[PDB]
Amino acid sequence: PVDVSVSIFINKIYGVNTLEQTYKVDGYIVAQWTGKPRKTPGDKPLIVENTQIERWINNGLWVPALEFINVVGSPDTGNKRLMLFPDGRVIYNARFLGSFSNDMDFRLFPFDRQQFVLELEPFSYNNQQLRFSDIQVYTENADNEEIDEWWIRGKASTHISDIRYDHLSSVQPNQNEFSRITVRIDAVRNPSYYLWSFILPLGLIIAASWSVFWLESFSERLQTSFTLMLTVVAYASYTSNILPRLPYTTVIDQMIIAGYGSIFAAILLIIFAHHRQANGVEDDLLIQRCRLAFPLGFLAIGCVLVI
Amino acid sequence: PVDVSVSIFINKIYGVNTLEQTYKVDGYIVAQWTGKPRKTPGDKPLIVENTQIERWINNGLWVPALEFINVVGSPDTGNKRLMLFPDGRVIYNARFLGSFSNDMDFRLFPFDRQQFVLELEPFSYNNQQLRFSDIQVYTENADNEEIDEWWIRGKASTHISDIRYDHLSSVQPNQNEFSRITVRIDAVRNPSYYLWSFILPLGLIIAASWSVFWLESFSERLQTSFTLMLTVVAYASYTSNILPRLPYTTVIDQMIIAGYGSIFAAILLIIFAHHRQANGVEDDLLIQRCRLAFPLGFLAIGCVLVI
Amino acid sequence: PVDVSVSIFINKIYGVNTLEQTYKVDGYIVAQWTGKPRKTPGDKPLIVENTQIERWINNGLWVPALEFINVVGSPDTGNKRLMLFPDGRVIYNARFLGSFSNDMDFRLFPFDRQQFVLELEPFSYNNQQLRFSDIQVYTENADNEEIDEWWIRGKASTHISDIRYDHLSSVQPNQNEFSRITVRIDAVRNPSYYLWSFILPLGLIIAASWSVFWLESFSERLQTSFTLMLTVVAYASYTSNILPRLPYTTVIDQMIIAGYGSIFAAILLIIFAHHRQANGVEDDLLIQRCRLAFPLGFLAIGCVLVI
Amino acid sequence: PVDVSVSIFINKIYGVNTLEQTYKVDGYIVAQWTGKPRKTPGDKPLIVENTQIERWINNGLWVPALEFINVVGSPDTGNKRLMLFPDGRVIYNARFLGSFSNDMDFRLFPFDRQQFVLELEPFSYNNQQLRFSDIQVYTENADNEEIDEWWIRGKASTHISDIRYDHLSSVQPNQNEFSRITVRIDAVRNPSYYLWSFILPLGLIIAASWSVFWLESFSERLQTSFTLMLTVVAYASYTSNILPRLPYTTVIDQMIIAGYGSIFAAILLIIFAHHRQANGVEDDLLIQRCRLAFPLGFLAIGCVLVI
Amino acid sequence: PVDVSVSIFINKIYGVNTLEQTYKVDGYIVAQWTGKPRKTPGDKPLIVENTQIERWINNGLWVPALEFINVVGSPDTGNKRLMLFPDGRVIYNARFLGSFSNDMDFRLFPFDRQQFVLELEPFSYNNQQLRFSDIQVYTENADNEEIDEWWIRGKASTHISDIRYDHLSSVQPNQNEFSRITVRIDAVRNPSYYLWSFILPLGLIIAASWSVFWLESFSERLQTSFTLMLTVVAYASYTSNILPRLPYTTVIDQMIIAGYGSIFAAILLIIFAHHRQANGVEDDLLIQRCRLAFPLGFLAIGCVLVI
Ligand SMILES: C[C@]12C[C@@H]3C[C@](C)(C1)C[C@@](N)(C3)C2
Ligand SMILES: C[C@]12C[C@@H]3C[C@](C)(C1)C[C@@](N)(C3)C2
Ligand SMILES: C[C@]12C[C@@H]3C[C@](C)(C1)C[C@@](N)(C3)C2
Ligand SMILES: C[C@]12C[C@@H]3C[C@](C)(C1)C[C@@](N)(C3)C2
Ligand SMILES: C[C@]12C[C@@H]3C[C@](C)(C1)C[C@@](N)(C3)C2
Ligand SMILES: C[C@]12C[C@@H]3C[C@](C)(C1)C[C@@](N)(C3)C2
DSSP states (O other): OEEEEEEEEEEEEEEEETTTTEEEEEEEEEEEEEOSOOOOSTTSOEEEETHHHHHHHHTTOOOOOEEETTBSSOOEEEEEEEEEOTTSEEEEEEEEEEEEEOOOOOTTTTSOEEEEEEEEEESSOOTTTEEEEEEEEEEOOOOOGGGSSEEEOSSOEEEEEEEEOSSOSSOOSSOOEEEEEEEEEEEEEOTHHHIIIIIHHHHHHHHHHGGGGGOSSHHHHHHHHHHHHHHHHHHHHHHHHHSOOOSSOOHHHHHHHHHHHHHHHHHHHHHHHHHSSSSSOOOOTTTTTOTTHHHHHHHHHHHHTTO | OEEEEEEEEEEEEEEEETTTTEEEEEEEEEEEEEOSOOOOSTTSOEEEETHHHHHHHHTTOOOOOEEETTBSSOOEEEEEEEEEOTTSEEEEEEEEEEEEEOOOOOTTTTSOEEEEEEEEEESSOOTTTEEEEEEEEEEOOOSOGGGSSEEEOSSOEEEEEEEEOSSOSSOOSSTTEEEEEEEEEEEEEOOHHHIIIIIHHHHHHHHHHGGGGGOSSHHHHHHHHHHHHHHHHHHHHHHHHHSOOOSSOOHHHHHHHHHHHHHHHHHHHHHHHHHSSSSSSOOOTTTTTTTTHHHHHHHHHHHHTTO | OEEEEEEEEEEEEEEEETTTTEEEEEEEEEEEEEOSOOOOSTTSOEEEETTHHHHHHHTTOOOOOEEETTBSSOOEEEEEEEEEOTTSEEEEEEEEEEEEEOOOOOTTTTSOEEEEEEEEEESSOOTTTEEEEEEEEEEOOOSOGGGSSEEEOSSOBOOEEEEEOSSOSSOOSSTTEEEEEEEEEEEEEOOHHHIIIIIHHHHHHHHHHGGGGGOSSHHHHHHHHHHHHHHHHHHHHHHHTTSOOOSSOOHHHHHHHHHHHHHHHHHHHHHHHHHSSSSSOOOOTTGGGOTTHHHHHHHHHHHHTTO | OEEEEEEEEEEEEEEEETTTTEEEEEEEEEEEEEOSOOOOSTTSOEEEETHHHHHHHHTTOOOOOEEETTBSSOOEEEEEEEEEOTTSEEEEEEEEEEEEEOOOOOTTTTSOEEEEEEEEEESSOOTTTEEEEEEEEEEOOOSOGGGSSEEEOSSOEEEEEEEEOOOOSSOOSSTTEEEEEEEEEEEEEOOHHHIIIIIHHHHHHHHHHHGGGGOSSHHHHHHHHHHHHHHHHHHHHHHHHHSOOOSSOOHHHHHHHHHHHHHHHHHHHHHHHHHSSSSSOOOOTTGGGOTTHHHHHHHHHHHHTTO | OEEEEEEEEEEEEEEEETTTTEEEEEEEEEEEEEOSOOOOSTTSOEEEETHHHHHHHHTTOOOOOEEETTBSSOOEEEEEEEEEOTTSEEEEEEEEEEEEEOOOOOTTTTSOEEEEEEEEEESSOOTTTEEEEEEEEEEOOOSOGGGSSEEEEEEEEEEEEEEEOSSOSSOOSSTTEEEEEEEEEEEEEOOHHHIIIIIHHHHHHHHHHHGGGGOSSHHHHHHHHHHHHHHHHHHHHHHHHHSOOOSSOOHHHHHHHHHHHHHHHHHHHHHHHHHSOSSSOOOOHHHHTOTTHHHHHHHHHHHHTTO
C-alpha cells in the first residue's frame, strides 16, 4: 500500500455562506510518495509544471487523484508541479481555492463557535492501495485579531482514519476501506460588531419603549406605543437586510421578538389600567407606576431565557 | 441490449431557487455494465482516472453517455474513474454538482412540501440498445434537522420506466422508447424561523391594531389607524426584502393583505360611527364598542380560509 | 445547396432579465442533412457522442456551424451526438442552455405579454450553400400555469426566411443571403402576486387617504395628510425593492404617482379651504365636505388615463 | 507591413456597470489580409471553422492576435471561421461578447451622456509589421428608443491611429509604434423613468414641506417639521435602494440634500419666529408668513447652480 | 542561477470587495531571461503567440511558472506571447486580470487609506535556480481623479526580496529561499460622496434632533423624541443597505450609534426635568433650557473621541 504523506497550507479561510453552510479556503496541497527510481537530467531532481504533468501522466506516471470529499463544486486549481526525484520519490504540489462544506450551527449568532473542516480521500484507491501516512497542516496564522471577524483558537487539529463503505462494487475480501485525512480548524465569532451596532441600539429602543409609562394622559400613553411598535418594525427591517440569512432565529432575532412582546404587553397594561374601574376612568395609581416594575421584569426574563 | 446498473450518492441538496423552480445537488453517479473480457495488467481491475478516460474512449471504449434529464445547464463534474475488470465488467464513477428542475408549488410557504428529483436517461441509446437494470440511491442522511433549511423525509423513491417519444428524426421501427431512472427525495420546510420572526409579530400588529377602538375620541380613533396603516406598510417591506421571490401570494403575503384589510375596515367603522348620527358627533356607543366585534370577526373570516 | 432540417425542443423558458431584455431557454437542437454514403460497422447507423465528434471533423466530416443569431454570449452545451447513416445522412443532436436576446416592452407590467424568440442561422454557409428546408419546434407543454411565473400561450410560431446582407466579403454576386430560422413563443405574465400584494393595498391606501376630509379640524386635516405622504413613500420604497429595473414607468409606478398626486392635491385643498377667508377659519362652509368630490373626481381622472 | 482591414458588427451594447466604469458589447470582428497564394479544393475559397482553425495555425498559418485594449477580462468567443481564398487572401471571422472599459462620468445622472468605446490593437506586431488599412463599423441599430435603457445617437466615430510606446526592448530602429483602431458610439441616458418617479414626487415632497408654515400653532409648526424630516429620509432610502452605485453625488443626490437643506432651515426659522420676540409669543407674524418667501429662494438657488 | 527581469503594467485597479479584502487588477506581465542561443527564421526574433507556446514547451522550452502569491482564484489570462531571440534571450508577455487579496483595515471609512499590492514568486524555482534581477511597474494613470472611486496617490513601490520557508517538502540544504517581487500602490478613498450624502444629512438629523428642547410642554418634548428615534432608525437602514459590509464598525457606524445615544440621553433629561421637583411641575429652567447645553455637550464628546 503506497504511503502518501500529505500537507495542507491554509492561506485564507473566508467567505462563509450561512444559508449554504459553506466557507472558502485558499491554499496549497502537497502530496508525497515513493515510486520506482528514475533517471533524471543531470541527477538533480526533475521539475514538471502544469501542462507537462499530463504528458507525464500519459506515458504512464501514477499521480493518484486525491478528491476533497467535502468540497461543494470542484475547486479552482492554480499551478501544478511535479518534483521527480531519481531515488524514486514523487512530490505533487498544487494551489487550490475551493468552497468547502460543513455542518454549521448559527443559532447563537453573533456569539457562535464554528469549525472549518477539510476532508481528503483518494478518489479511486483503497487503503490497500494508497494509505495516508501523515498530514501536516500549516495555518500560516496569528495576531491582529480585532480587525479580524473570526478568532482562530487552535492550530489545526487532525485525524487520519479508515472509512468503510457498506455499499459499493463487486468487491468482497476487505477492499472497501479508503483512508481519510480530516483537518479541523476551530473558531469563534468576534461579537463586538454586533454588540455595538445591533444589540446596543436595539436595547436603547426597547429601553425607551418603557418610557411610555412616564406619559401623562391615556391618549398619550396608548397612541405612543403605536409609534414604538412601528419603530421595532423599522428596526427589524434595518436588521434583516444586513444580518446573515438562516432558517432559524438568532439571539438578535429573539431580542426583536421580545421588543415586539414588550410593547404589545404595555399596550395591554395601558389599556387595562384605564378601563378596570370603580367608575369608568379610574387609572390604577399603582399599576400606572409600573414604570420601574417591568423594565426589571424584562431584565429578569432577560436572564431566564439565557438559562 | 446492454444492462446498465446505476447508483446515485446524494451529498447535499441546497440552493432552492423559487422563481426558477430549481435546486442544487452534489453527488456521485456510478454506472456499471459488462463488456467482452479484457486482458488487464496483472489481473486486478484497471483503474483509469479523469484525463486518461478520454484516451480509452478515443480508442473505442464504449462509454455510453447518460444525461441528467432535468439538469439546468451542464453539471460541474469532478473526478471521474473508469474501473475495467478482467471478466468484462466496466464501472464508471464520477462526481457532480448540478442544478435540477422540478415543479415546485410554493403556495403554502413556509409550510410547503417539496420533492427533489433526479431523472436519468441515456443520450443516444434506446431501450433496445441500453437498458437500466436497477438503481439504488443512498442519502447519506441523518440528524440536525433543526440546523437545516429543509427536512428530508423518506429514504428516496426509485423508478425505472420506459419513455416513448413520438416525434424525432428519420428513425421509426421501435427506436423511440428510452429507459429512464427517476429518483425522488421528499422534503418539508423548516417553518419555525418564519413562524417566530414573521407570523407571530405580524400577528401581534394585527391584534394591537384593533386596540384603536379603545381610544376615547373620534379624532384619536381615525388619525391613529393611519399610523397603524403605515406600520403594516413598513412590515410588508420588511417581509418583502427577506422572503423568497414568487409569482403568487404565500400565506404570509395574505396575512399582510388581511392586515391592510383590517385597518381599512376600521377606518370605515370609525368614520361610520361618527357621521351616522342624530347630532353630528353621536358616535354609536355600540358600534364604537365593536372593540370585541371585528377582533373576533377577523378570527371567523380567518378560519373561513381553511376550506 | 444542402437542405438542412432543424428541430428545437424547448425544455424550460425562465430567467427573464428586464434591464437586459433577455431570457433563458433550455433545449435540444437537432439538425439533419445528407452527405455521400459512408461505411458503418454492421450496416446499422453509427453513433458518435460528444468527444468523438471533433475527431470525425478532423478527418474532414462536414459538420456546419449553425449559430444562434440572438444569443447573448455563447450557450452552455450539453451532450452532442452524431448519428452517421450508411445511406449518406448525418444527424446532429445537442443540448443547449442559452441566454437569448429580444426586444421586450415592459410598460404594462405586471400585465405585459412578451414573446421569447430563437433565431438560427449558419455561421459560414449562405443560402445557396446551405438552406433550411424546414423547422418544427416542440414545446413539451401542459398544466400548472398557476405555479409558474410565465404563461406560454401559443404552440410556437415559425419563420424560414432569407436574410440579405448588403455589406460583406470581397465576393459580391449572391454570397450575401443566408437562410434563417425564427422560432416564436408567446407568453403572458402570471400577474396574480402583483395584483393581490401590490395593486390592492396600494388601492386601499389611496382610498383610505381620501378619508382625510372626514376629520373635523384643519390641523387634523393638514397634519394627517403628512402621514399619508410618508405612507406613500414607505409604500414606494416597499415596492421598488421587489419590482424589476426598467428605464420607464409601469402601471404600478403610475398608481404611485397618482397617490402622491391625490395626497398633494388635498394638501392644497385643505390649505385653500381654510386660508381663503374673510377671517382665518372661513372654510368654504361646504368645500371641506368634498368627501365624495375628488374621491370620485379622482376616479374620473383614472378612466381617462386609460385612454 | 501586412495591410489588415477590420470590420466590427455591434449587436447589443448593454449592462453598463457604474461603479466599475464598464459596459458589455456583443458583435462580430472581421479581419482580412493577403498572404502568399494557396491551392484550395477546386479553386473555390476554403472554409475553416472553429476547431479546425488551430490545426491550420499549428501548420504555420499566420493568424495574428488582434487584442481589445480596453476589454476587462477576456471576451467570450462564439463561432470562428477562416476563409482561405486561393489568391492568398485570408478572412478571419468571429463573434464576441466583451466587457469594455472607458472613462464614465455619471455626475449629471439621470441626464448623462456616455460613449461606448472599442479599441483594437495587435498583441505582437508593430505598425511596420501589421498595419490597420481601414475600418467600418456597422451599428445595426434603430427605432423604439422608448423601450431601451440607452439612446444610441451617432453612427459611430472611427479613427485609425498610431500609438507610440516608449518602453520596450534593446531596439532602436522603429519597433515601438503599434497601429490602433478606435470605435466611438455616443449615447444618452433615457431619463424618463427617473423624471417621473424620482424628480416629480421629490419636488412634491419638498413643496408640501413648505406648507408647514400654514399651520396655526407653534407646536404644530415645530412638531410637524419632524414628520416632514422623516419623510425626506424615507424618500432617500427608497432612492438609494434603486439608484446606481457611484463615488460621487448625482443630480438626484443633490435634490435629496436640498430636501434635507429645506427642512433644517425651516426648523431654525420656525423656532426663530417663535422665540425671537419682545414678549414670549411675539411670533413674527411676518416671518411665519415666509410661506412664499423661501419657496422662490429655493427656486433661485436651484437655477444659480447652472451658473 | 537564471536572472529574470520583470515588468508589470497596471491597466486598472477596481472592484474592491470590502468583506473579502480583495481588489481587481488588470494588466500585463513581462518576464525576460536569457537562455542558450536558438536558430530562428532569418535571424530576426521569432514571435510565438497563444496556442503555439505549449508546443514549444512540449519540445522542452523552459518557460518557468511565476505565481502571483496573493491572487484569489486563478487569473483570467488574455493573449500570451513568446519572443524567442537568436542570441538566446526569451521574453514572455501576457495580459491578466486577477482578484488579489490583501489586508484592509476599513475602520475609518470613509476616510481610509488602502494599499493595492502585487506579489510575484516563481512556483517551482528557488533563488538558486531562478532569481529576480529587477522589476518595473507602469501605471498608465493620471488626471480625472474626481471621477474615480480611489485616488491613487504615490507612484508604485517595488521590493525584490528573498522568502525563507522553514518547513516545506523533505528538502533542507539551501533550497528554501525563493525570490519575491512585491508591488505596492498607495491609495486613498474618494470621501466626497459620503461627506455630502451621508455625513451631512446625518448631522442635520442629529442637530435638528436637539431642537426638541425648544418645545413648550412635556408631552411635546417626550413624544417628539419618539419620532426622532424612529427617524434615526430609518436613517440607519437607509445607510445600511448602501454602505460596504464589514465585520466591524466604521466612523459612520459610530455616528449612528452616537445619534441613537443623543436621543436616548434626551429622553432621560426630559423625564428627569419633569419629575425632579419641589411641587410636581418644576420644569428646571436650565435643564429644560439645556438647548445650548447638549447640543454643545455632544460636540465635546464628539471631539475627544476624535483625539
Ligand atoms: C467508494 C467511493 C467511490 C467514490 C464515491 C465515494 C463516496 C465512495 C468516495 C470515493 N472516494 C469515490 C470512494
Ligand atoms: C430521443 C431523445 C434524443 C435527445 C433528446 C430527447 C428529448 C429525445 C431526450 C433524449 N434522451 C436525448 C432522447
Ligand atoms: C455573413 C455573416 C457573417 C457573420 C456576421 C453576419 C452578420 C453576416 C451573420 C453571419 N451569420 C455571421 C453571416
Ligand atoms: C507593445 C505592447 C506589448 C503588449 C503590452 C502593451 C502594453 C504594449 C500592449 C500590447 N498590445 C501588448 C502592445
Ligand atoms: C421607517 C421606514 C418604514 C419603512 C419604510 C421606510 C421608507 C421608512 C424605510 C424603512 N426601511 C421601512 C424604514
Ligand atoms: C516552497 C513553496 C512551495 C509552494 C508553496 C509555497 C507556500 C511554499 C509557496 C511556493 N512559492 C510554492 C514556495
